[PDB]
Structure formats: structure tokens, C-alpha cells
Amino acid sequence: ADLEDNMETLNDNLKVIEKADNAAQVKDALTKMRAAALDAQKATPPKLEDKSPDSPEMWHFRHGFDHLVGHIDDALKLANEGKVKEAQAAAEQLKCHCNHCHQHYR
Amino acid sequence: ADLEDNMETLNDNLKVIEKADNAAQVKDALTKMRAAALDAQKATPPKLEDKSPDSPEMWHFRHGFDHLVGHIDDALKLANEGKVKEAQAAAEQLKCHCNHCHQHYR
Numbered sequence: 028a029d030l031e032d033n034m035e036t037l038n039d040n041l042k043v044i045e046k047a048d049n050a051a052q053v054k055d056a057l058t059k060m061r062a063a064a065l066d067a068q069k070a071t072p073p074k075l076e077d078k079s080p081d082s083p084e085m086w087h088f089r090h091g092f093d094h095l096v097g098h099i100d101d102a103l104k105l106a107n108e109g110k111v112k113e114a115q116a117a118a119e120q121l122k123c124h125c126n127h128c129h130q131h132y133r
Numbered sequence: 134a135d136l137e138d139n140m141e142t143l144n145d146n147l148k149v150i151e152k153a154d155n156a157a158q159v160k161d162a163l164t165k166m167r168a169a170a171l172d173a174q175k176a177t178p179p180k181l182e183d184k185s186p187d188s189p190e191m192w193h194f195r196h197g198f199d200h201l202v203g204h205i206d207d208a209l210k211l212a213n214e215g216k217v218k219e220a221q222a223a224a225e226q227l228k229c230h231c232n233h234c235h236q237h238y239r
């Protein structure tokens with residue numbers, strides 16, 4: 028899986044969560060999102076292609092996924108406790124971090 | 134202070150940060166925003182005034198201010214590091230979290 032594949036996993040599983048009817052369904056999608064986020068974190072995006080791998084921009088790109096995973100982990104906490112509505116609200120917090128990374132790096 | 138006053142403080146201090154030039158001004162404005170958000174978290178918005186104090190909507194409302202306060206902390210860290218422009222960009226990025234809560238409860 029390359030960066031664009033991971034991004035499709037992220038987008039698709041956001042829909043699953045929004046449509047979910049129980050917290051286990053939210054947990055399964057969040058689990059897939061966690062794996063796609065850590066895979067994506069290893070990639071170099073086209074826009075940063077001609078910068079150093081140790082560049083500040085690349086570290087800021089990679090840290091964006093750390094914060095996304097932190098939010099995914101926080102929602103997994105709620106999902107694993109049967110709190111489907113609260114886990115769905117927690118997953119809604121991801122959207123702004125999707126947007127903020129894209130603004131700078133997509 | 135009441136909810137609307139706290140929102141005025143968040144709104145006006147975002148514009149202060151936009152127009153500042155040095156770290157002290159950005160940190161001072163971010164500090165006021167942090168306290169206003171922590172106070173707002175205690176409020177009941179008009180759209181939820183006939184809800185139960187533990188309803189999922191009030192949970193969601195309160196959790197939005199936890200999220201916002203954490204990102205103000207991140208911008209405060211950048212200001213304390215002398216990265217004025219990075220902190221101004223982080224402050225402008227708060228607007229997405231503001232909008233998220235608004236779409237639901239403003």
C-alpha cells in the first residue's frame with residue numbers, strides 16, 4: 028500500500044464509522060485507520076519530494092500522523108467501552124486534522 | 134463569565150494573534166483564549182438547555198473544549214519557543230475546531 032491507498036482507507040473508514048450501528052463496528056474501522064495512518068507516516072508525499080528526509084517539513088508531516096493516531100486511540104477507548112455515539116463524535120475530531128495536513132502537504 | 138462573553142474572547146484574540154509581531158503578544162492572546170475555553174466548557178449552550186446534564190450532546194459539547202484547549206497549548210508551546218509565525222499558523226488552524234463545534238451547537 029502506497030500513500031494514496033492509505034488515504035483511501037482513511038476516507039472510506041470515516042464513512043463506515045459515521046454509518047455504524049454499534050461500537051464494535053466503530054472499533055473495527057478505527058483499527059484499520061490506525062494501520063493506514065502509520066503506513067502513510069512512512070511515505071514521502073509528492074509535495075515534499077524535493078526536500079531532505081530530515082527536513083523540518085518532513086518531521087511536521089510525520090507528526091501530523093502521530094496526532095491523528097492519538098485521536099484514533101482516544102476513539103478506540105470509547106468504542107471498546109460500548110459508547111457508540113461518543114466514539115462516533117470522537118472520530119469526527121479527525122476531520123480537521125485531515126484538513127490541516129492537506130492544506131500544507133497535499 | 135457567560136458563554137457568549139467567552140466566545141467574544143476567543144474570537145477577538147484570534148484576530149489579535151493574526152496581527153501580532155512578537156511572541157509575548159501571541160502568548161498573551163493565546164493565554165486569554167485558554168482561560169475562556171475552560172470557562173465556556175462549564176456552560177450550557179442555548180440549543181442544549183432542555184437536555185440532561187449527562188446527555189451525549191453535552192458530552193460532545195464539553196469534549197470539544199478539551200480538544201480546543203489542547204491545541205491552544207500546542208500553539209502556546211510554539212510561541213514560548215520563539216516561533217511566532219508557526220504559532221500564528223497554529224492559532225488560525227484552531228478555526229476548524231471552532232467551526233466543528235459550531236456546526237452542531239451554535
Ligand code: HEC
Pocket residue numbers: 030031034035037038041072073088089090091092095121122124125126128129132133
Ligand atoms: C498528513 C499528516 C495527512 C493527514 C493527517 C491526512 N492526510 Fe490525506 N493526504 C495527505 C497527502 C500528502 C496527500 C497527497 C497524496 C498524494 O500522493 O497526492 C493526501 C491525500 C488524500 C486523499 C486523496 C488521495 C488520492 O488519491 O490522491 C484523500 C481522500 C485523503 N487524503 C483523505 C484523508 C482523510 C479522510 C484523512 C483523515 C482521517 C486524512 N486524509 C489525513 C496527507 C495527510
Ligand code: HEC
Pocket residue numbers: 136137140141143144147178179193194195196197198201227228230231232234235238239
Ligand atoms: C463547542 C465545543 C465550541 C467551541 C470549541 C467553540 N465555540 Fe464558539 N460558540 C459555541 C456556541 C454553543 C455558541 C453559541 C453561544 C450562544 O449563546 O448562542 C458559540 C458562538 C460563538 C460566537 C458568536 C457570539 C455571539 O454572536 O454571541 C463566536 C464569535 C464564536 N462562537 C467564536 C468562537 C471561536 C473563535 C472559537 C475557537 C477559537 C470557538 N468559538 C470555539 C460553541 C463553541
Ligand SMILES: [Ca+2]
Pocket residue numbers: 046047048
Ligand atoms: Ca447503519
Ligand SMILES: [Ca+2]
Pocket residue numbers: 064065066068069
Ligand atoms: Ca509509522
Ligand SMILES: [Ca+2]
Pocket residue numbers: 137
Ligand atoms: Ca448571540
Ligand SMILES: [Ca+2]
Pocket residue numbers: 199200
Ligand atoms: Ca482530554
Ligand SMILES: [Cu+2]
Pocket residue numbers: 094098120124200204
Ligand atoms: Cu486534535
